[PDB]
């Protein structure tokens, strides 16, 4: 469980290059799971 | 669109880490080439529309 930009749901996947991809979570190319994402612009975002 | 530029490009050295640590580009699919195995290698001529 983590919380990401929604730019980096792209990221999270075998086989993707990026920031995110490469310096926080990375996924084998053998991923045998599954993978749930949903907004949450209400709940962790400041008015600030 | 139709007037597409294209730029040949010749004699010169390109890192293309530019490109990576660059975060404005929404749209960046390499079809024919790994893009992070760029650097190691050489190319007769590039072309940039």
């Known amino acids: 469980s983590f919380v990401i930009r929604g730019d980096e749901v792209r990221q999270i996947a075998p086989g993707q290059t990026g920031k995110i991809a490469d310096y926080n979570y990375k996924l084998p190319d053998d991923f045998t799971g599954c993978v749930i994402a949903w907004n949450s612009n209400n709940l962790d975002s400041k008015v600030g | ?49």
């Open chain 2, 1 to 49: 669109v139709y007037a597409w530029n294209r730029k040949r490009i010749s004699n010169c050295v390109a890192d293309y880490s530019v490109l990576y640590n660059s975060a404005s580009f929404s749209t960046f699919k390499c079809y024919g080439v790994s893009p992070t195995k760029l650097n190691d290698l050489c190319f007769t001529n590039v072309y940039a529309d």
